[PDB]
Design a protein around this nucleic acid. Structure first.
Length: 1113
RNA sequence: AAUUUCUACUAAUUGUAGAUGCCGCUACCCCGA
DNA sequence: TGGTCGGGGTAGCGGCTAAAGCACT
DNA sequence: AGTGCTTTA
């Protein structure tokens, strides 16, 4: 499995730590960044609600009020069967948004705001603010490096693929017209809204047949006009919705109309305009006739009852009168809350009034909205008026904590250079302000001061032999763009004439995508590029070796060859004393980096991320196709969190005890030094970096899952398979196997152990009893352990275990499916944390690394070339397919039950009627009894059962022997139950003695039982019949294992889990893991059966699975 | 009870063993004061 | 069941982005 | 005769 190595350009962002070195307090202000007092954020009442609010004008004065409304502009049946046979993929385009130029009509108006042109947001005041304590008019701050592609322009594509299901400006026309073709295929006499709308009497629209400018719902008036009034009238009326019949209540949750949820620009942008008095203004100042009704209590300020008159009317018949469920008219029991919305006869009429009296008044109308319940004004009036137009902006007034990660109004400050760190190339040394440097071992970092940026352009040669080595590099970005950018600029055209024919060819674009042309002229263009780069000196410093003239790289291949060669790092000696001589002038912000790892006596193994950063500048290695520093690397300061006083800590003499068993025993004193210990990471200030990384830079191929597995598929080196399962006693018991089902491991991941350190961790009961502690402590207050953080850490540790197993035994991972599977079901892990375990196991299997103090990195797990075992995942919808080396198989009717009979659920369902029970018995061949082993054995054949193709060969004779510890129900003493049957046999000898039947003849005693008729007799016979087959034991507290299949496995084995043999699963969930492994080997055989890049589906049928499980020997 | 970040660690020790894309685009969900 | 406020996550939704003209004071 | 840069490409 030596393929799959650096076969996908993965990328990461190392998050390292900074500490200064030298003086490192350069500036007179002592900030060293000058992001130390922004002051733009405290008392933000002047500025709040300006930019994002005037986005409302920016959208309103640009969108097209009168679009091309006609759905019939396509002029097409679509698909009603009244058309020609030849579709020719045109009808699906008619379903699709085949129009193009409505965006062109949208963008007709540039639409700058009343307050200011873009220049007010682009002119550099070079200040954090201009506003004042009294008021502000055109407040702004400096530009901060390309807001355009990032913050505000994302809102300006509404008919596009923005990947959010609310900007519904074209999915409405995409969906409603197919729905109307359905509504004319069938007719609307099944829906309730056609006539429940006692008035309008329509499902959605005033007249459903006609088209309409549905974007009226998108604007300020919102979906209230579309929905809210008929929502209000929807109540206990229409008793046939509450009294079933052929229609008008065809389902319990119909709600037959909906326009899809409010657009991104809605729930947003309350009312305010450019005025010379400022307000925080979270509330509707224009007009709050809105009422988000929530109709339970009226006059709750001055009534104090959650239901107004229901509280007054009665208190006994609220529960004394029987509920509606068993005793089914809704209009007499629930119509109270529908007639409760008695409308207020009048229209607190108030606006933002008293702010001018003193400088500080904040929230008048917000307090009015808070204290007053919704105004009960904008009702319904039995017909769907523009009532409740301003719920859409009260929806800004509420939930304002939810929507605001980043607009352009709140970007953070940094060094006095917007482009900080955008590129650390040779030529851009002067402007990008960044410089890399390092001594031996300690990795330094330099940032030039703004005053003397050009001071570093002249490094004098070495004088003293105290080096302070400095690193620089050189590259060539985006060669699709730089190559046409250079040699076609008007300046370089003057400095070097190109041929007019080639310029004409490129301007018309003969050589671009989608054309047949003279390949010799394409070669002429390529030569023009090559020789005009030969003209250069800065570009010519690169060792560029492009292709040959016999057949040159295509233009995409040309840019690939340009990009992959274009990166070279080097270094030059610098006098340390000279750095000391210059830093006095406050001209260079120096830094250096370390963490837990960089310390020689700290011999312990490295963190994985300090290995990458350390090996990045491994100057002895070229790092040609290995990690390359790239892109912006913005820094981040945080302040100190917790004080030393709050750090409660013992002084010298802290011989405290160990929490762990087997180390609280051996070393209870906890021998230690007296550098007394505590988490210090929050005890001080901090500086942090982000270094983007393109691990496996320059790799020339992105591939797929079949590509990411088929190399293993031809020649195996992987045949083993990991099983995974969960259960009660073991949380996540795992089982690996071999090709032919030989179990090779039985380790419970409840227990893990540091083998190299070779001291037992006793992880069992540090897992199960600790999560039990969380279970019994989380009910009343938020425990220290989050509800899933311990599971996250445990699964994180398990990733190392499974990765080591994969690399040791060659085994491939075969986690259970959760799509072809049916239920959600009772589970040991509640919210499908197993799903994010799949995600984590993919995410790490993108790349184990040793991460030790010294390395010889030329290895598969040597941190140079990490094996990319699985390609990246896209979606859980994409899951259910083989994610590289993480296959999936279903898990249903086999997670608990061995397949030897498998009828844990009885082959028939439970019997109630006496004659049906008799018929159910009559399929049996013989019910018998032998007093030797006391076995009251039975007999039956497969063919006489429902679903007579599900199983295969149910001719086995279910026996009855051995004890069972089954979970009785004997609720006499408040849900008591007998913990066991004494033995499964002999509990019905008394039942036979009730009739005194000759049960020792060897006859089919059934012949008498059909003649016997007693309800309790057959009820108890049912209980013992289901219980003798209950082959999994309900393990007690202080668990005991008994996997006891009544059918013999040819040797009276019963797969008895009390035994010690390895092939026998030790526990029930271990047997389930074994079953998942046996499905895993089958799906691997299914894959091997194929012989092309095409692969059959991963799924299984229950019949086929039961067939193979029967034929597992 | 030590970190750069998270779980758990004491683990010969101002540390141990294993894991992680930071800013960022706005959305859904699912049950609930 | 449209009835209102969540409430915290879930999943598919920018990244893994760096030189050169060019209009510049 | 020009440094900031938003532009491109």
């Amino acid at each position: 499995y030596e393929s799959l190595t650096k076969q996908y350009p993965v990328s990461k962002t190392i998050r390292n730590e900074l500490i200064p070195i030298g003086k490192t307090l350069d500036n007179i202000r002592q900030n060293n960044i000058l992001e130390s007092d922004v002051k733009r954020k405290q008392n933000y009442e002047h500025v709040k609600g300006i930019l994002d609010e005037y986005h409302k004008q920016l959208i309103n004065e640009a969108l097209d009020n009168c679009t091309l409304p006609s759905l019939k502009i396509a002029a097409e049946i679509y698909l009603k069967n009244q058309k020609e046979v030849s579709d020719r993929e045109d009808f699906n385009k008619t379903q699709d948004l085949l129009r193009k130029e409505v965006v062109e009509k949208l963008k007709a108006h540039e639409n700058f705001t009343k307050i200011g042109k873009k220049d007010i947001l682009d002119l550099l005041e070079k200040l954090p603010s201009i506003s004042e304590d009294d008021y502000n008019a055109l407040e702004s701050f400096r530009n901060f490096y390309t807001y355009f592609t990032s913050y505000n322009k994302v809102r300006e594509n509404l008919y596009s693929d923005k990947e959010k299901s609310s900007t519904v400006a074209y999915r409405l026309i995409n969906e409603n017209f197919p729905k109307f073709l359905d509504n004319v295929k069938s007719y609307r006499f099944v829906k309730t809204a056609g006539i429940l709308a006692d008035g309008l009497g329509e499902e959605e629209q005033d007249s459903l047949f006609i088209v309409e400018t549905f974007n009226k719902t998108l604007t300020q008036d919102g979906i209230d006009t579309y929905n809210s009034q008929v929502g209000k009238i929807n109540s206990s009326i229409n008793l046939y919705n509450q009294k079933n019949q052929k229609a008008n209540g065809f389902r319990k949750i119909p709600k037959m109309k909906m326009l899809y949820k409010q657009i991104l620009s809605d729930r947003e942008e309350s009312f305010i305009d450019e005025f010379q008095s400022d307000e925080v203004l979270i509330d509707n100042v224009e007009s709050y006739v809105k009422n988000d009704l929530a109709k339970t209590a009226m006059s709750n300020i001055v009534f104090e009852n959650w239901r107004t008159f229901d509280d007054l009317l009665n208190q006994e018949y609220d529960l004394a009168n029987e509920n509606k469920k068993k005793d089914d008219s809704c209009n007499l029991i629930e119509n109270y809350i529908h007639q409760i919305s008695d409308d207020i006869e009048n229209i607190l009429a108030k606006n933002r009034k008293a702010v001018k009296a003193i400088k500080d008044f904040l929230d008048s109308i917000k307090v009015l909205e808070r204290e007053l319940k919704l105004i009960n004004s904008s009702g319904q009036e039995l017909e769907k008026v523009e009532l409740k137009q301003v719920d859409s902006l009260y929806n800004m007034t509420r939930n304002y904590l939810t929507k605001k990660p980043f607009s352009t109004e709140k970007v953070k400050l940094n060094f006095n250079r917007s482009t900080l760190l955008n590129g650390w190339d040779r030529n851009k040394e002067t402007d990008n302000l960044g410089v890399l440097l390092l001594k031996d071992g300690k990795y330094y970092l330099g940032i030039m001061n703004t005053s003397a940026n050009k001071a570093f352009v002249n490094p004098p040669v070495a004088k003293t032999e105290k080096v302070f080595k400095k690193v620089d590099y050189k590259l060539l970005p985006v060669p699709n763009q730089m190559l046409p950018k250079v040699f076609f600029a008007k300046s370089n055209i003057d400095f070097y004439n190109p041929s007019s024919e080639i310029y004409s060819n490129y301007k018309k674009g003969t050589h671009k995508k989608g054309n047949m042309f003279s390949l010799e002229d394409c070669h002429n263009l390529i030569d023009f590029f090559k020789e005009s780069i030969s003209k250069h000196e800065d570009w010519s410093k690169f060792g560029f070796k492009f292709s040959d003239t016999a057949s040159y790289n295509d233009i995409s291949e040309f840019y690939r060859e340009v990009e992959k060669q274009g990166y070279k790092l080097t270094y030059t000696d610098i006098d340390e004393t000279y750095i000391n001589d210059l830093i006095e002038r406050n001209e260079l912000y120096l830094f250096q980096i370390y963490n837990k790892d960089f310390s020689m006596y700290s011999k312990g193994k490295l963190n994985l991320h300090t290995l990458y950063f350390m090996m990045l500048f491994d100057q002895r290695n070229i790092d040609d196709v290995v990690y390359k520093l790239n892109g912006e690397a913005e820094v981040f300061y945080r302040p100190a969190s917790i004080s030393e006083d709050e750090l409660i800590i013992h002084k010298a003499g802290e011989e405290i005890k160990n929490k762990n068993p087997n180390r609280a025993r051996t070393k209870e004193t906890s021998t230690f030094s007296y550098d007394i210990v505590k988490d210090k990471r929050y005890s001080k200030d901090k500086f942090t970096l982000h270094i983007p990384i393109t691990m496996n830079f320059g790799v020339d191929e992105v591939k797929r899952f079949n590509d990411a597995v088929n190399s293993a598929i031809r020649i195996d080196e992987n045949v083993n398979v990991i099983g995974i399962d969960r259960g009660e006693r073991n949380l996540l018991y795992v089982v690996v196997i071999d090709s032919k089902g030989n179990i090779l491991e039985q380790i419970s991941l409840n227990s893990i152990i540091n083998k190299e350190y070779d001291i037992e961790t006793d992880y069992h009961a540090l897992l199960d009893e600790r999560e039990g502690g969380r279970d019994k402590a989380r009910k009343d207050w938020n425990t220290v352990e989050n509800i899933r953080d311990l599971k996250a850490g445990y699964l994180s540790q398990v990733v190392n275990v499974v990765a080591k197993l994969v690399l040791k035994y060659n085994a491939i991972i075969c986690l259970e499916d959760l799509n072809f599977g049916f239920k959600r079901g009772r589970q040991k892990v509640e919210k499908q944390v197993y799903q994010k375990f799949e995600k984590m196991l993919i995410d790490k299997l993108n790349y184990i690394d040793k991460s030790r103090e010294q390395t010889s990195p030329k290895e598969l797990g040597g941190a140079l070339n990490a094996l990319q075992l699985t390609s990246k995942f896209k979606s859980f919808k994409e899951l259910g397919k083989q994610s590289g080396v993480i296959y999936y198989v279903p898990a249903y009717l086999t997670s608990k039950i061995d397949p030897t009979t498998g009828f844990a659920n009885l082959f028939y369902m439970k019997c109630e009627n006496v004659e049906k029970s008799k018929r159910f018995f009559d399929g049996f061949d013989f019910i018998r009894f032998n007093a030797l082993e006391n076995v009251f054995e039975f007999g039956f054949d497969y063919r006489s059962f429902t679903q007579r193709a599900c199983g295969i060969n149910s001719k086995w004779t279910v026996c009855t022997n051995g004890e069972r510890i089954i979970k009785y129900r004997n609720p006499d003493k408040n849900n008591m139950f007998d913990e066991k049957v004494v033995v499964v046999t002999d509990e019905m000898k008394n039942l036979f003695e009730q009739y005194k039947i000759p049960y020792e003849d060897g006859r089919n005693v059934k012949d008498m039982i059909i003649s016997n008729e007693e309800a309790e007799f057959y009820r108890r016979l049912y209980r013992l019949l289901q219980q003798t087959l209950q082959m999994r034991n309900s393990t007690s507290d202080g668990t005991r294992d008994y996997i006891i299949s009544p059918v013999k496995n040819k040797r009276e084995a019963y797969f008895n889990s009390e035994l010690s043999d390895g092939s026998v699963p030790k526990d029930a969930d271990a047997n389930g893991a074994y079953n998942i492994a046996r499905k895993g080997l089958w799906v691997l055989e299914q894959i091997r059966q194929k012989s092309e890049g095409e692969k059959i589906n991963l799924a299984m049928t229950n019949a086929e699975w039961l067939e193979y499980a029967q034929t597992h020997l």
